[PDB]
């Protein structure tokens, strides 16, 4: 998800509907990437509660 706003924000800065420089949908199979989120706490458990 966070990649999508980067491309959308990039398009706004260049004043174009679609941007040449994109952070998403590249040719690289970057399917193992992880990013910080609110599910996991400091002990490795879920934050369902």
């Amino acid at each position: 998800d966070e990649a999508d706003e980067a491309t959308k924000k990039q398009a706004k800065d260049t004043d174009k509907s679609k941007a040449q420089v994109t952070y998403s949908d590249t040719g690289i199979n970057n399917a193992n990437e992880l990013s910080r989120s609110g599910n996991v706490d400091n002990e490795g458990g879920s934050n369902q509660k």
Binding site: T14, Q20, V21
Partner: protein
Amino acid sequence: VLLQRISPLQIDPTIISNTMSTVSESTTQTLSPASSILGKLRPSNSDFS
């Protein structure tokens, strides 16, 4: 953007068009090699981010 505002280099795509110096042959159904490469390059576009 900062690099562009302090660099003495200007990108002028008309150099490519002048060098080719090919007149329009849209009447011909086929595309000449000179006209074909110009279509791929699209010198009209001015975004060089």
